[PDB]
Design a protein around this ligand. Structure first.
Ligand SMILES: NCCCCNCCCNC(=O)CNC(=O)[C@H](CS)NC(=O)CC[C@H](N)C(=O)O
Ligand SMILES: Nc1ncnc2c1ncn2[C@@H]1O[C@H](COP(=O)(O)OP(=O)(O)O)[C@@H](O)[C@H]1O
Ligand SMILES: Nc1ncnc2c1ncn2[C@@H]1O[C@H](COP(=O)(O)OP(=O)(O)O)[C@@H](O)[C@H]1O
Ligand SMILES: [Mg+2]
Ligand SMILES: [Mg+2]
Ligand SMILES: [Mg+2]
Ligand SMILES: [Mg+2]
Lengths: 603, 599
């Protein structure tokens, strides 16, 4: 049957289409049910997820290949962002494969690389019936709600299934419950596959002069701020196994959910929100932003620590994040100029990933881009405008605020006399939050913004907080961006493998392990204080946030490879993994002036 | 400045438009799916300000002065209810900024009254931001319309308006602090009495007073001939005071009811009390979330009299008697009424059309009714509203005309895909078809069948089909919610103590036993405080769970027991009607009584 042909339904009346493409017949491939993404039309995963959502209102995180599903340990309940537990069971197990359970196949034979995922509709005395997409492309029998039957075998309490193929491996089934009995543990990876490795290029004088094309305005923009220099030794680059990246993608999609699951919890209790030191006048605004703009986050960066010790996360820059051009364009150019290998730059598709985000965002036709007057932010801004243009939107880059002004009534318009109602800022939300605390001793009934002024002096706050102006990133991003959320994440996912015990007061265990003091609203590594268990200040950086609240996070020093400390950074575009990049530095603390270290994933 | 001209903004960037009409749906002001008011009255700005700045809103009200009588506020993002206090102009409680300032109708603010927002409080005056008082631009960047003179004498704060014939009721603050505040006003039971009357038997109803060549009117006749009740020359009346009361009571209980629904769907232990097949629960939740604002109409059962105003149930699901108060009674009054009074359910047809316009319903709506000449006009009365709303309709009587195609897609007796459906059928009926059956992995509906034999669930629970009323409505329409409303709003003036067991209290006051998912007064058991069964009705729900509601027998005016019913159209009062009965139990076979409101 043709691609998209309704072949029939599964229990509850869930459609099953023919995913049969054909070299004889890009965003339209996204399957959505309202604002919730189901998958890719019409893979096995898309159906599996849509089945669970339409029938149980739950969904499993984003996954590259279907076989990967078997490694997940939880599902998300949509209507409340609540996380439920998911258990795994091997083929041939005491825990019986009940109807509604997930059945996963491992890449192999009939499912060479992708693997497979299906749903069990009904169990029997010696056979189970299942529903699945992308494996059968012919219209099912009228009324039959299952695509294939599988010979089950019950022996002394052990349920085993035999597929209808002779070259496929049925991993097992998955059930949503707290009863861990008979289940398999959460797969931890071999630390050795997580270590960072350094390497060098054959110095054929590849980066001796103008290797960065200055014809390209974007690259020339980069130079204007950094010249023809990415990092000290441009002939040296690090690498990570494909196994390691997979891990990163995994830990990125998972921590994203966790972060939102906690963001949603904080906005549901004034006792927690009260900890982020955010102007009480904005609380209602935060909650509204969280509710109506739940899926509007464009991108964010996650700081990690990776090596033999395992993978841990330092912070999640969900509000403002740079380094997009670096791992995005410069490195591509770097590789294109000097890397003659088989590896690949993990951020070689960030621009495209962004355009996709913007297309599916509800941003308006014309988007004013707000940046500071730092020539250092010119390329970051132009890098995004490019993505925006690729998405089709129209833009105009605003440098500073001198161009803004109000009409007679009080409407926010730009220099050319146009109305500003949708902006993408490079400005941190915290900066706007400060223009509020300046006049904190006044009793204002609402956020103190100007809708008019003699000198026509517009302020950052007089824009981002102007009700009818749509902003990216959404206001709620400030919550998962504030480090005050770490203690809560630990409180919610205690002892999680990617987490570090964090608290507002140097508790007891932090003491015996050492810890890092970090301002909740900081960044660029400012005012960071590392204290080991021997109560010795391993390092201390200055900064302006020296007067904010702090949080204490169990120490977990960055690894040192080839004379530098290497931190790993993954990107999140629209909630899913978007790429990776390294940030090396002489000190344990990555600061603003750290360098970008070329990275190549090898197989 | 002409209509809808931006004059300026209030603190927080809340626009203020010129509501100069001198220069029909287009007038509704929204912010997303949430209603803000009528463009561009005072109430509109006041509400939009509270929603934009604090994420809260206040219930629908006829006039602005009516705000002062409210005692709650709804926080959108969580459908949670917040307490609101009212203070008189001259109260020790200073009028802080962000508070509502209500003007009682009078002088400059004749019949409407008025409401504004206190932006900044000084020491000798205050500044406010209103909307329907001016109509000219505001000074460049001025975030306030007027400054009012505040006088402070011995702990008390007073305010003088700029007009000499206006009356300032006071301000309102959302606080738990109840000091200095005004207790919620109550109405003298004497105005709540239901009076009886009679028309001049000039012989106006002795023959064919029903047009009959009006598909609707005729439809009605095919089921009941030319009769509405026993004596067409007798009617009842209620004061405008009582109607406004009935309206206030409706709007409030509606919110109260959804607050309980939102709660029920957030706690498994609670939802478990309704006996709704677990398999559906996820659907229920999903429905509440996505269909929150898609309810079209519901009906409330009230006991009104000197004693006060109590509500028995809220038929949020399968309504009824719409045509009655809606049309027939209009043909009644038109035909035989002379007085100045009016029918409280006249513009019901328009209220529904309005609700339908703003519903997200698909373009072609299939109307599903059972095969009873009785439900015909109810279905055809609704169809007319849809048509006035611009939607296309096709009435399906029974499930025979339906069928599937090769793939398994639902279609009507003309091969058209059925995707939008307004049902008269009760959701509980569908639920039963699920109880009839295996450890099914989902709602057991059919997508194919040898005889092409479709069932009710095979339609209502089919994903791509958009049903009205949405699934979540079965919660507020299930009597199990009563015990919860009591737990949430203890001794609320409109609620009656209800429990799933005859607690001590009920025993002393007497009670009514009623099946949680029943209707039409089926299996109703009324026991007195003497412990004597006052009345009993048999029924088809005898076996399901019950709840006990403290007895509170309907009044008896002119030989019959009069019960009052209010309609809800889009979560707001849509009209009123009566239902008399020889007995204390209103049933499916009870008559409708012409109701007239007089001032
Ligand atoms: N001849 C022109 C006279 C113009 C008088 N303008 C005085 C304005 C005064 N204060 C107001 O307009 C507020 N008016 C109101 O109270 C009115 C009545 S339709 N009600 C509505 O806005 C309905 C709101 C709606 N019921 C809701 O619930 O939000
Ligand atoms: N718990 C920790 N253990 C060891 N080093 C840490 C820890 N937390 C932070 N650091 C170091 O400090 C730097 C700054 O902390 P980070 O969490 O990224 O905040 P930001 O960059 O926003 O200031 C990191 O890049 C890392 O090198
Ligand atoms: N607490 C009560 N005290 C006295 N009569 C009651 C009480 N509750 C219900 N009734 C009577 O029983 C009838 C049926 O109850 P109701 O709550 O409307 O359920 P339904 O009409 O759906 O069966 C009402 O119309 C009313 O006359
Ligand atoms: Mg960092
Ligand atoms: Mg940071
Ligand atoms: Mg009822
Ligand atoms: Mg009733």
């Amino acid at each position: 049957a043709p691609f998209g042909t309704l072949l029939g339904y599964a229990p509850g009346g869930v459609a099953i289409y023919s995913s049969d493409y054909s070299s004889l017949d890009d965003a339209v491939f996204r399957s959505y049910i309202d604002d919730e993404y189901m998958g890719h039309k019409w893979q096995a995963v898309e159906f599996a997820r849509r089945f669970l959502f339409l029938n149980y209102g739950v969904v499993f995180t984003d996954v590259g290949m279907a076989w990967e599903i078997f490694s997940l340990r939880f599902l998300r309940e949509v209507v409340n962002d609540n996380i439920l537990p998911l258990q795994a069971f091997p083929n041939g197990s005491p825990r019986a494969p009940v109807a509604g359970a997930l059945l996963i196949w491992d890449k192999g034979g009939e499912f060479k690389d992708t693997g497979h995922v299906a749903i069990i509709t009904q169990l029997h005395g010696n056979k189970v019936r299942i529903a699945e997409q992308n494996v059968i492309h012919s219209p099912l029998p009228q009324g039959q709600q299952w695509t294939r039957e599988l010979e089950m075998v019950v022996e002394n309490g052990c349920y085993t299934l035999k597929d209808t193929f002779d070259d496929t491996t049925i991993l097992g089934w998955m059930i949503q419950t707290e009863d861990t009995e008979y289940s398999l543990p959460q797969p931890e990876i071999a630390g050795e596959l997580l270590k960072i490795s350094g390497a060098r290029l054959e110095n054929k004088g590849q980066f001796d002069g103008k290797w960065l094309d200055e014809k390209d305005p974007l690259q020339n923009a980069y130079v204007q701020a950094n010249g023809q220099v990415i990092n000290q030794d441009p002939y040296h680059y690090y690498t990570i196994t494909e196994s390691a990246e997979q891990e990163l993608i995994k830990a990125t999609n998972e921590l994203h959910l966790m972060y939102l699951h906690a963001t949603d919890k904080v906005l549901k209790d004034d006792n927690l929100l009260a900890l982020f030191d955010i102007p009480k006048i904005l609380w209602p605004r935060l909650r509204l932003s969280w509710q109506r703009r739940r899926h509007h986050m464009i991108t964010g960066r996650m700081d990690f620590c990776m090596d033999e010790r395992g993978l841990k996360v330092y912070e999640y820059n969900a509000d403002s994040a740079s380094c997009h051009t670096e791992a995005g364009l410069i490195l591509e150019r770097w590789a294109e100029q000097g890397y003659k290998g088989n590896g690949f730059n993990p951020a070689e598709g960030l621009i495209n990933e962004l355009a996709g985000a913007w297309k599916h965002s509800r941003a308006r036709p014309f988007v004013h881009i707000m940046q500071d007057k730092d020539i250092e932010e010119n390329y970051h801004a132009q890098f995004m405008e490019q993505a925006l243009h690729q998405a089709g939107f129209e833009t105009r880059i605003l440098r500073g605020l001198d161009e803004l002004g109000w009409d007679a009534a009080g409407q926010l318009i730009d220099g050319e006399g146009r109305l500003v109602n949708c902006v993408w800022k490079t400005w941190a939300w915290e900066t706007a939050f400060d223009q509020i605390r300046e006049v904190s001793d006044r009793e204002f009934a609402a956020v103190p913004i100007r809708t008019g002024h003699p000198q026509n002096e517009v302020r950052l706050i007089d824009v981002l907080l102007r009700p009818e102006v749509l902003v990216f990133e959404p206001l709620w991003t400030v919550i998962p961006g504030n480090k005050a959320i770490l203690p809560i994440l630990w409180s919610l996912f205690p002892h999680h493998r990617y987490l570090l015990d964090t608290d507002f007061t140097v508790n007891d265990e932090l003491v015996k392990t050492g810890y890092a003091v970090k301002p909740i609203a900081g960044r660029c590594g400012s005012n960071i204080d590392l204290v080991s268990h021997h109560e010795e200040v391993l390092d201390k950086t200055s900064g302006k946030f020296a007067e904010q609240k702090n949080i204490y996070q169990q120490l977990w020093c960055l690894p040192k490879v080839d004379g530098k400390y290497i931190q790993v950074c993954t990107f999140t575009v629209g909630g899913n993994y978007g790429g990776t990049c390294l940030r090396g530095d002489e000190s344990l603390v990555i600061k603003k002036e750290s360098d970008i270290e070329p990275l190549i994933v090898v197989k």
